[model samples]
Target chain A: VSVNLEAKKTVDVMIEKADDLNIAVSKLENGATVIDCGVNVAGSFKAGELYTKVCLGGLADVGISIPGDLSEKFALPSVKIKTDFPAISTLGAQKAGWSVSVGDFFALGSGPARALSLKPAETYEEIDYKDEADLAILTLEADVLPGEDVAQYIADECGVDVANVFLLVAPTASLVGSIQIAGRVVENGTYKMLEFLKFDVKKVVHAAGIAPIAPIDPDGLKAMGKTNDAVLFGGRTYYYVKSEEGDDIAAVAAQLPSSAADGYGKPFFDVFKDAGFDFYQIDKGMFAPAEVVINDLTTGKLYKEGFVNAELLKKSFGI
Target chain B: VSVNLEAKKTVDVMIEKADDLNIAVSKLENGATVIDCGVNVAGSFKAGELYTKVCLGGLADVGISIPGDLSEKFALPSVKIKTDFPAISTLGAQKAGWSVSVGDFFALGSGPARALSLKPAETYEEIDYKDEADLAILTLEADVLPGEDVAQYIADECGVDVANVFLLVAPTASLVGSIQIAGRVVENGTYKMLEFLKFDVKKVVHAAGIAPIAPIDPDGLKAMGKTNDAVLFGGRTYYYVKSEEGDDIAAVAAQLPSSAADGYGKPFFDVFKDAGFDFYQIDKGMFAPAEVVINDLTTGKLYKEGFVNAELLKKSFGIE
Candidate 1:
């Protein structure tokens, strides 16, 4: 993913410009492309307005062939591109080409103007400056809603499975931008808490693939005395569910009727199974004495026997 | 440049295999895609084997729905897309609809296979797990050449401008990943050196835009230093030159033969001109005799002046 989209363009420009200078542009796999202009103005010149004018004029000419649009966007003087003769001859007397002609006139004045004004009879070939660009880096800045379930959302939207998801909790903005959140395990006891909720490492894979969710501000913990926020818990918990497609179970629990049979208030297992989430889970009991459960619901075969204890049943109630 | 191409047949196989496990497929922006089958038993499910099966299966299923070819591809059993009778007891289980039906005789001695086997309806719809990959955290390992102008080379071949190039040199390989490279800057001296090289600061406009350059190894540096190379006089110099047609001047100079001239060595100035290089002089002679040379080559304009002495040039040349 660390791609360089502009390198090609820069190299092309360097090569083109270097070639224009009649300087051999030698390319090394890992070396700078250098060009040596023959003229060596080995002495001091004046400063201030005259200096700015001369520099600006020459720059204006070079600008035409380089980032020409940039110069225009900056509103440089049009006369900088003019091709006129110069009156003085400080350096060797020379006629200017179309690109540098205007700057030459302004630099040397009327003397070089005549020859500079004459346009080239032949057409000039434009340089390609290879324009190859691709995305080298990608950034994401998102706020996950409490218990929003990143894995499930991504799977539904992007069609990525839960196992491929990775997650990371950053201490700062700096940390958040660089860490790969995919398939990362949170070792800070929170992961254990998720495991207790039936969102063990195996199920929380979806969220890890799509996004790396972390505490919005880890440093804030120093002042608040709390190392994390309810949001972080929500993110982790939701991701675990999304990773396992357990959102259906969570969803069904959220919408419990509140009215139920005599022995149990509501059938948590039935709700989860009714919502097309029966594909997951192994041998587990429901409320009361004991209910036979099937690990693979596709065949409808009875599995092991066990009672759905209060702790296991309570999992469906809380966030 | 980091492109990975896969054949259509390959894509189909992957999707079909994913479907067998009830897994979904997705595409990545980089053309390649992925399928994440949750809880894969290593060695039991090899990526290479899956790849071969999917590719071959895809070719055979061309122009036809893969779901129909399940029976021919694998003889174990076939699940019909639709069935006339509901086999289970549920609110909506009895309606005549699509289902997988097999006689009890087909069951294994123990039971059904532990793995799920559901096929996807199509190919392009194959799942891609990498699409959501967080590049910020995953570090890539690359081998870099020494004294290779890493920044410039990356800028060229990587399709990014040299000005946008940023480098981070960590002390250890462990520190070379994403988090460590972010929110840091070159020290004062290093920054000054980079600025002198005309590196564009605009490229590193954001925190994520920075790129880490591999640090030079001690052995590499030792190798470089072993050579009997002497520091050239005025080893680092800047120049400013001006002309009417900077492009033409540059082009004519660029067109010059690379061969060295009889005297003065290869008309370096013409070479530079052809190379479209800006020329500036730090020497104090050849122009105003004993004056400083600081002209803007772009405009043929001058800057401040200073006194020059023959001793300075000699000293400069001797160092080279």
Candidate 2:
């Protein structure tokens, strides 16, 4: 509970040190705080990391590593994320389930604000968690800045005053964009287990993952392809869960990787283009991570599946 | 500058919730606090991680990852460590450079209390840093518990009252011991660059590393071998530094790995046995990390060296 308040403390630090972090902070006419991470400023890697921490509601430790020693096919820098509370950190707070459309202005919103709004009532119902706080922090992945009307609408939906709303915006082609996307490796795995496999979200206790940050691209379509490719073919996820007696968690682990999908071999952009750029036409199972490892604490069993496709990752990253 | 105060806050939490943490905490006759991390009780992974945070003076973020995917030859659970202040976190605080000797009781002393005492005053003088705080927290890697006389000696050296001193004790063959040793990957890299190569420590802006935790061994000599093998052959370290304009940092990077030492191929235990179990007879360069990557922020250049010897690690772990 009160994830918004926890995230607000981070937002306060960002705003207070905007100059040092190389981010722009200004207030909309409605008084909501809007922080520009990469659009109007050259955001540092540290800023991107702090932005991802805010996205996770300050529940995960975000760091960087060069995992070239892990796989010779790919040698890029990656985001290293770990969290003790997986359900609350990912599905309850970091998932971008909110589509904010404020009359000619649109942005994909995620972060602690979703806890207050319960954007998808079904998610909060399943996770059985919500936030009650005066502060609401919403991160926007958009190219353009939101207007005063957009801020007012977000404030209204979050059930907080406009002055208490904080919006962090960045485009998909910037440094912040690449990091935040790779940071979603854990969320993507949690979503796959919860939505597709019908796994009990309550059993999940700890989560950690690593995914390479996509190199920035000027073309939005290529940028989307690179970012999606990073997680689908390059990411590795691990989880520690408590299983009930006589539970066959092994079957769920078998299907948790993107390789199980029908459209897994090619880059995501090619798949989307072949499907005429309609997301509905593509296979839903393709959204999973590249590799997964699950440890059942109660049963003292371990299940591992999938493989990191460095060959596909190199191709998609245009290496 | 008050690393001791920052670490004391973490110690305070460990004391307040000792039951939940599965640690034993008690007060010595001299009014000093003593914590049994793994010597007298079973310590959890979370407790070991927190013990490492205290070791770094609360300057680093520590987490765990099963790096089976990182390398198939050795896929054990690992400790991932990252810090913005590497020099102060590793040298000024976490280095076990102090020998706490009181009568017959002896233990390697580390943590923020070392900052106050400037144990090995040369290190603090080189770092140009010192801690001035009323509270002092010291960690000991000793198999046996310390008595009141030992605690009083520590309090006196730290320039704090016995009531304000906290001592955390763990052994070399314990869960906390394995975790804290693996957690020293970053510090190992920092020490290599600082002591051996004479690199300017001030240039290190950030550091992150990962090293596999050795399996719990009932044998002390075997346990020490496994733990040393983890870092010497399995750890990977990365650093971001602001090098000077004319520095040839590449030359230093080439020699940062343990492979560069004279006694590099065999396990540390075998090497020690060959040296008659005398540390001074062996090459000091064998104490480096497995791999290293350094990025020069000033020149926008990257230098990488060494290789992760998974084969050596698996052999040392006794895994076929």
Candidate 3:
């Protein structure tokens, strides 16, 4: 649906920040090089965190951040995201649902690079999202760098030059890892709002989001828990869901918050502990924002829901 | 005073952001390359904004910024800067007061590259500063990129090979322009305090400073005025002055703020207009911060002064 050279533009920027960001770019002896964005790469804050924003912009210019007013309880950073094509931009384009497996090496591929390889096909089909480009940029959330075989597999799938394909990797327990997770505050809310609602996420013209920066936890599991809590308990997102009929839409708007989930009140780590640290065992809705604001462009009406849980934030952030 | 390879580390990082940050890097025919950090480059907010911080880290690791609480009022951003060696670092190292000229081209230089050039030999001697490095990093706050001739002059002066020399340029009106100027809030205050007070800046073991970011203005003069006002009216710094005597510190602390000057109350442009837009006509004393805090690591006492002029900040920032 989009015609931008999304992957190529972002990959160029990533190469520049590779050295100081502790992002090591290594050749696989197969011509294709592996760019360590964060995972297994003692990643700095800017490398992992800033690179995600570049990748997001690879598809659209729909993000801005502000520091929330709650400095005493904790410093809550906020973001606002809005796009003329939300379905194609955020969901179909930016979402990392594509599973990549080249023999036991597994990675969930995300960013503009996904546009080149329409692996799932179904999600891209629903939104009519596809791109024809010479360069591809893919993000992997694995602790291991993708070797030559994996790189060749992706290059062949995308039908692009191996050198034209760039892969970024980051783990969950790093400084860059935490920053990138917090930057996803808006995306998490947008997806949750669309799941249960009858409204067309494609009609959404504007989206705003924010989340607190989770402190670095050396333990991977603890860092993952902290990042989730920061988003679920602290993230705030506001979206403009433009409608055609706009038949007094309040019901779906009311249900659009992390509070609606069965796992709403408790800290994320506690909820994860009770669910035996298994994601499927927990309620899917809690992955949404702590709060949501929806503005209907058709009727010019606004619907708001939920609150930023300060006490839960305090406990999770340990501030 | 400091022998660390600050410029080299910073250059390695600058090359990374030069691509996505909308920065362009090109070499002169004579083999010297130029990095357009912001000038003539359509630089983004974070790249140029963040580049200034990297350049600072070139000499030392002594700064941190927390996102400010005032999210609604112009999204004011804040920072904290400090170093163990204040005189050798901020004063001797970071100040962009060194003027460079080669034929018709001229620029004011700052950052780790200065440690190599040792220009304004007096200032370097006062702090006993110089560095021997293979690579040199110099930040220029001019509108034009340096050509091969200018690059050669800097390389020859720094005693580094022409290819080993890297120059970064950002004009005073761009997004990076505002961010880097605001980033210098601590240095401005530290130099001012050291100048007026009896304290030995060399004795200062630690220093910390913070200032809000000034919004970008397309007009060069207007942008420069806004940056100056942001520092004068809102900048706050804390320095740990390690005094060996542990003597009384009162008068110097009282006169710390820019407001202590006769011309502090007006907006920067208004004040500049009164002085016929000439910096020399204005009060030099008005260039410091709104407030300063000094914690004596040696004497174990604290000295503080002034408050941020919120109303002045509001008026200058056009918050109302």
Most TM-score-accurate candidate: 2
How many clashes would you count in candidate 1? 107
Q: Please give the RMSD to the true structure for each candidate, in Å.
A: 39.5, 7.8, 10.7
In candidate 1 the C-alpha lDDT for residue A255 amounts to 22
> Please, what are the lDDT tens digits per residue for candidate 1 over residues B196-302?
22222211111100111112223322211111010011011111223344233222222221111122121223323444544342211111111212213333232
Q: TM-score each candidate.
A: 0.15, 0.68, 0.60
> Candidate 3's residue-wise lDDT over A1-319, tens digit each?
4422754565566677566455788777667867886555555434544456544635444332323211222333233344565666566556666788998888677777666777567656665668778766677776677888888988998888887667777766554555567767777766665565645566667665667656555566667777888788887777787677645457766787788888678878788889998988898788877877778887888888888887887677553
Give stretches of model 1 more than 4 Å off: A1-173, A176-195, A198-319, B1-320
Better of 1 and 3 by TM-score: 3
Better of 1 and 3 by lDDT: 3
**Candidate 3 regions with alpha-carbon error over 4 angstroms:** A1-4, A40-46, A53-57, A62-73, A76-82, A156-164, A246-248, B1-110, B117-210, B213-320
TM-score of chain B of each: 0.14, 0.97, 0.90
Q: lDDT of all the models against the reference?
A: 0.20, 0.83, 0.67
Q: Best candidate, DockQ-wise?
A: 2
- Interface RMSD computed for candidate 2 is what? 5.9
